[PDB]
Amino acid sequence: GWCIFIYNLGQDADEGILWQMFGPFGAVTNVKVIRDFNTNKCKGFGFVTMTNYEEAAMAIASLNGYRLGDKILQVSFKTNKSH
Ligand code: NA
C-alpha cells in the first residue's frame, strides 16, 4: 500500500476522523494517530495506508489544505517525485 502522512491535526482528532476523511477516496487498510504520552491528546500527526496509488493521490490532492475544524491540515506522501 501507499503511506499518507497527515500533519496539524487538532488535539481531538482520532482514528475515526482518518477513516472518515480517507475512506471516501478508496480502500484504506490502516490508520494511526500519535497521541501525547502525558495528555493522551492527539499530537497532530496521523498516517493512513491506501491500497491504490491513484486513489491515494486523489486523497492527498483533495485533502491537503483541508480545514478540519480550527486547523488547516497538511497531507502528503513521504517524499516528492518528478514523475
Ligand atoms: Na496519557
Numbering used by the authors: 243 to 325
Give passages from the manuscript.
HuR/ELAVL1 is an RNA-binding protein involved in differentiation and stress response that acts primarily by stabilizing messenger RNA (mRNA) targets. HuR specifically recognizes adenine and uridine-rich elements (ARE) and uridine-rich sequences in 3′ untranslated regions (3′UTRs) of mRNAs. Hu/ELAV proteins share a common protein architecture with two consecutive RRMs, separated from the third RRM (RRM3) by a less conserved, flexible hinge region of variable length. Here, we report crystal structures of HuR RRM3 free and bound to U- and AU-rich RNAs.
We initially selected two 6-mer RNA substrates: a sequence comprising the AUUUA pentamer derived from an ARE in TNF-α 3′UTR, (AU6tnf – UAUUUA), and a poly-U RNA that can be found in class III ARE elements without AUUUA repeats (U6 – UUUUUU). Both RNAs were bound by RRM3, with a Kd of 156 μM and 19 μM, respectively. We observed a substantial increase in RRM solubility after RNA binding and were thus able to use untagged RRM3 incubated with selected RNA ligands for structural studies of the complex. This allowed us to perform a comprehensive and comparative analysis of RRM3 interaction with three distinct RNA ligands: AUUUA motif-containing (AU6tnf), a U-rich motif with sparsely distributed adenosine residues (AU15) and a poly-U motif (U6). While in the structure of RRM3 with U6 and AU15, a uridine is recognized, in the case of AU6tnf RNA, an adenosine is bound in this pocket. In RRM3-AU6tnf and -AU15, the ribose in position 1 forms a (water-mediated) hydrogen bond with the main chain carbonyl of Lys285. On the 3′ end of the RNA, nucleotides in positions 5 and 6 are closer to the RRM3 β2β3 loop in case of the U6 ligand than when AU15 or AU6tnf are bound. In the case of AU6tnf, AU6 and GU6 the binding is predominantly in fast exchange, indicative of a weaker interaction. To summarize, the core of the RNA interactions with RRM3 is formed by three binding pockets with canonical aromatic residues from RNP2 and RNP1 (Phe247, Tyr249, Phe289) that recognize a U–U–U/A RNA sequence motif. The affected area correlates best with the dimeric interface found between chains A and B in the structures of RNA-bound RRM3 suggesting this is the dimerization interface in solution.
